[PDB]
Design a protein around this ligand. Structure first.
Ligand SMILES: [Fe+3]
Ligand SMILES: [Fe+3]
Ligand SMILES: [Fe+3]
Ligand SMILES: [Fe+3]
Ligand SMILES: [Fe+3]
Ligand SMILES: [Fe+3]
Ligand SMILES: [Fe+3]
Ligand SMILES: [Fe+3]
Ligand SMILES: [Fe+3]
Ligand SMILES: [Fe+3]
Ligand SMILES: [Fe+3]
Ligand SMILES: [Fe+3]
Ligand SMILES: [Fe+3]
Ligand SMILES: [Fe+3]
Ligand SMILES: [Fe+3]
Ligand SMILES: [Fe+3]
Ligand SMILES: [Fe+3]
Ligand SMILES: [Fe+3]
Ligand SMILES: [Fe+3]
Ligand SMILES: [Fe+3]
Ligand SMILES: [Fe+3]
Ligand SMILES: [Fe+3]
Ligand SMILES: [Fe+3]
Ligand SMILES: [Fe+3]
Ligand SMILES: [Fe+3]
Ligand SMILES: [Fe+3]
Ligand SMILES: [Fe+3]
Ligand SMILES: [Fe+3]
Ligand SMILES: [Fe+3]
Ligand SMILES: [Fe+3]
Ligand SMILES: [Fe+3]
Ligand SMILES: [Fe+3]
Ligand SMILES: [O]
Ligand SMILES: [O]
Ligand SMILES: [O]
Ligand SMILES: [O]
Lengths: 172, 172, 172, 172
């Protein structure tokens, strides 16, 4: 590659791998979005929430692909694994799956930062620090706050709580 | 008729019949509207909802009458049957009646489309596809979502649920 | 399903299947987009073209999922197969792959319309006629025009032709 | 120095050295700029391109000098070596020299980041990551794309290609 400089084959491949993980996360949020729009689930604000996250994850993989091209890497695509569930349960259930997905993405970002740090690749490191790491932290914090409010709204009176949460916390 | 072309007497008569069904549906929504405005029911957002539907149904029969005249058909009017109930119960009860009415209207639209398809009358078919069929589907979906939220708000704590739903979902 | 009406299990399943085909088409256009952005391909207007198509295909599957929910269907997701190529060749090569993909999507839309016509499902038919069929026809025509201009720019002097086409036809 | 803190004499000296390298790069782009403005070269867009880079490199050394003063370092200036060529050839030739210069600057930035990382100097590191490293990567990618388009426009018909490239890619 005429442009490649300080860009290890390991990072290149781990970037391709993180791309597939963003693709799959996007796909998982697509499924969660349409799930909460089902006439028998009918929680519009929950649906909007997961739909925004599909979009955000798509921006992530688009940014990883762009950086791949900028460093002289070559994208390679693999199959995107279908989401882990077909039916997502109640808002708390779904929010827990989302939390678990985001922790997985955050761990992959941290592992990739470790890798690029090990190959003394500071461009790759700060790319992750600037466009990914703070976004994950903010988003995980938000999901935690959501889980805390669902839990406080939970238990015996849980149908009402899920309604209120969707109406009063989730936008629209 | 100097203008009539490709317009079967069967469609003409089924159009007159669907007009009476829209008239009766309009009438049913009138009754539901004023019912939820009673001082001892007092759910303004529910009342507004059913009042908007009376208006929407009236637009439907006005459009059917206009098309009747445009094709060279002749309108004939029959008595409009009074609504099936005088008292409509609680929001879920009323919403179920509305769902059942809309399914009946949708079945009549589908039967009329089948008929006009059988008389190879594509103008009539696409008139229904453009001005009626998508409206029914959207409206049925909405009523289903409503029923799902009333159900989740239902059971022991149902008075509070009906209040919240009217305040937080139904506009005004 | 409390809302489902005139919505066959066959259409439901063929809709789920067409969703996966749009997902895979989107994915193929993603790969084509980043491919033409490689420092050693470097045809920005070609890249923009395929990137817009990824977005358009994504709008398609989002619309299919929305309609699925509106009719009372249930989305089911399968793995998304990786694109057929890793490297896409020259502009004419890529444009031919795109043409072939769009013909496949158009054939699937036509087969689904045939199916829904066979189950006398006019809502499904006109949904496809309104949001899909004309879009395919316009897009195929455009791809054909592109192929005709690449061909006229082709042969011995082909490097120059690909440059001119990207600069003077493809926007930016 | 009353302000100096965590600022090694090695970084200080390597900063002075990188300043001279930016000064010399600026000087090289000055020469390339006026070269493409010669009546017998006459490629205005190529000239503008290299002139903008002289300016960009000057901003770099001005920023390095400012940071030097901010950390309590002392600037020391050495002779600026004349550019390596008097005559720069054709657009591809010049673009290759520019690529080679930018790779040299990028290697010096990476070496300085390694150094400041070794002296645990995170201010210096992030200064480079924020104001230098991404700029180099973007600029190298652009130069690569340029070289790819010149190459595709090259060979037998090369005079025409250089004209088109200057007119249709290079701004003005
Ligand atoms: Fe939001
Ligand atoms: Fe399961
Ligand atoms: Fe399941
Ligand atoms: Fe940093
Ligand atoms: Fe860092
Ligand atoms: Fe928002
Ligand atoms: Fe929003
Ligand atoms: Fe709303
Ligand atoms: Fe309203
Ligand atoms: Fe009764
Ligand atoms: Fe009664
Ligand atoms: Fe039609
Ligand atoms: Fe039709
Ligand atoms: Fe209670
Ligand atoms: Fe309204
Ligand atoms: Fe209103
Ligand atoms: Fe009020
Ligand atoms: Fe465009
Ligand atoms: Fe192959
Ligand atoms: Fe290949
Ligand atoms: Fe049709
Ligand atoms: Fe020639
Ligand atoms: Fe455009
Ligand atoms: Fe555009
Ligand atoms: Fe451009
Ligand atoms: Fe410029
Ligand atoms: Fe020489
Ligand atoms: Fe010389
Ligand atoms: Fe750093
Ligand atoms: Fe400019
Ligand atoms: Fe300029
Ligand atoms: Fe000029
Ligand atoms: O939102
Ligand atoms: O409304
Ligand atoms: O575009
Ligand atoms: O420029």
């Amino acid at each position: 590659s005429q442009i490649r400089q300080n860009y290890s084959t390991d990072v290149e491949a781990a970037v391709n791998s993180l791309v597939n993980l963003y693709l799959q996360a996007s796909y998982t949020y697509l499924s969660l979005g349409f799930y909460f729009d089902r006439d028998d689930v009918a929680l519009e604000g929950v649906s909007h929430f997961f739909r925004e996250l599909a979009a955000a994850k798509r921006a992530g993989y688009e940014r990883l692909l762009k950086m791949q091209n900028q460093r002289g890497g070559r994208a390679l695509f693999q199959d995107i694994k279908k989401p882990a569930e077909d039916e997502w349960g109640k808002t708390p259930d779904a929010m827990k799956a989302a939390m678990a997905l985001e922790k997985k993405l955050n761990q992959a970002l941290l592992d990739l930062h470790a890798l690029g740090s090990a190959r003394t690749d500071p461009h790759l490191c700060d790319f992750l620090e600037t466009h990914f790491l703070d976004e994950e932290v903010k988003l995980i914090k938000k999901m935690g706050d959501h889980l805390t409010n669902l839990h406080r709204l939970g238990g015996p009176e849980a149908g009402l709580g899920e309604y209120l949460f969707e109406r009063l916390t989730l936008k629209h």
